[PDB]
């Protein structure tokens, strides 16, 4: 229905606003663009599904996310990719791990405060009907 397409439009507006707020935070600069194959040729041999905040905006606009659950699986993949690629005790690996945890925790905190639970449940029931 037109009403269901208005529901998914409102979801995309909400997801673009949360993603912009994460992308401008200086802590999360390393997560804003794909890893350059030049500088890290090893990356795409270890990490089988790369993800970053520029790719997330492109996915919103391609209508890849019908629920906030869907979106949070890609925020969780940005964070788990950084934990698995940088697992060592040295300061450069500990710094990116602490940033990746802060990106995940910050996204979940904004959604807990600003997402209405009944809006999410509506998106889930339209998705399950298709």
* List of residues contacting ligand RGV (CB under 6 A): 68-69, 72, 108, 111-112, 115, 117, 120
- DSSP character for 38? T
- Give the nearest distance from C-beta 69 to ligand RGV in angstroms: 5
Please give the C-alpha separations between residue 95 and each of 38, 44, 92, 99, 109, in angstroms, as whole numbers.
22, 21, 5, 6, 21
Beta carbons of 50 and 44 less than 8 angstroms apart: yes
Q: Of 96 and 111, which CB lies nearer to ligand RGV in the complex structure? A: 111
- Give the nearest distance from C-beta 3 to ligand RGV in angstroms: 20
* 3-state secondary structure at position 23: helix
Q: Of 22 and 68, which CB lies nearer to ligand RGV in the complex structure? A: 68
- Give the nearest distance from C-beta 108 to ligand RGV in angstroms: 6
């Amino acid at each position: 229905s037109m009403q269901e397409e208005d529901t998914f439009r409102e979801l995309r507006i909400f997801l673009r606003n949360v993603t912009h707020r994460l992308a401008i935070d200086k802590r999360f600069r390393v997560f804003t663009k794909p890893v350059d194959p030049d500088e890290v040729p090893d990356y795409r041999t270890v990490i089988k599904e790369p993800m970053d905040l520029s790719s997330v905006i492109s996915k919103i606009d391609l209508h890849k996310y019908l629920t906030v659950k869907d979106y949070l699986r890609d925020i969780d993949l940005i964070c788990s990719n950084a934990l698995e690629y940088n697992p060592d005790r040295d300061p450069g690996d500990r710094l990116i791990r602490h940033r990746a945890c802060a990106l995940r925790d910050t996204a979940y905190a904004i959604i807990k405060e600003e997402l209405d639970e009944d809006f999410e449940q509506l998106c889930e029931e339209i998705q399950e009907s298709r």
